[PDB]
């Protein structure tokens, strides 16, 4: 059920770009934004938007290119049914590097490539290709 709101993002997004749409909205959650930011910064979506006051709403502007979308794939790693955390060197690398992997660290979220150089580590939110 509501149990997992994160894999709801990745799914809505993976599904949105599936049905070649340009904008996908969902209720807003602090962590969600943190992720949103990540995807933007890393160039995986044109950008976020958050016009929610009493009932926080989040919109994501999807990107595209040629005969495909930006995100070749996006999977949930750590879930509420089995949390996964990784050290500094144990941090996972997506597609030999060509692809971020959102890892939350005790000093704010990051990307596998980010946190790596960062020096620390933490739970890994998901896999985006």
């Amino acid at each position: 059920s509501m149990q997992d709101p994160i894999a709801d993002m990745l799914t809505r997004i993976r599904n949105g770009q599936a049905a070649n749409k340009a904008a996908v909205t969902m209720p807003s959650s602090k962590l969600k934004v943190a992720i949103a930011n990540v995807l933007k910064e890393e160039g995986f979506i044109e950008d976020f938007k958050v016009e929610g006051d009493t009932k926080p709403e989040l919109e994501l502007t999807l990107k595209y290119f040629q005969g495909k979308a930006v995100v070749e794939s996006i999977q949930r790693v750590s879930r509420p049914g089995l949390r996964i955390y990784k050290r500094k060197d144990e941090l996972p690398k997506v597609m030999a590097g060509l692809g971020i992997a959102v890892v939350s660290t005790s000093k704010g979220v990051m990307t596998d490539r980010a946190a790596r150089q960062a020096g620390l580590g933490g739970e890994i939110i998901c896999y985006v290709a």
Partner: protein, 80 residues
């Protein structure tokens, strides 16, 4: 300090025989999920203070009875 420990009772009835419990998140060695694994430690209770349910601090110390090697240190909260 010399290794402090938090834990919750188990019984009020025992007369100087206060036992306790210890929770500890533990990553199953193969499946990775996080399991709760308990540890029950019998503890020394002088003038049988702190009742049941309460949470307490404990210290590992010299034996005192067939399997009973811990003594309370401080009581925290009394309604659970």
């Amino acid at each position: 300090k010399i290794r402090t420990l938090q834990g919750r009772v188990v019984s009020d009835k025992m007369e100087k025989s206060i036992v306790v419990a210890i929770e500890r998140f533990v990553k199953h060695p193969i499946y990775g999920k996080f399991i709760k694994r308990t540890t029950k430690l019998h503890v020394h209770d002088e003038n049988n203070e702190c009742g049941i349910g309460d949470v307490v601090e404990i210290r590992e110390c010299r034996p005192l009875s067939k399997t009973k090697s811990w003594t309370l240190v401080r009581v925290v909260e009394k309604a659970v």
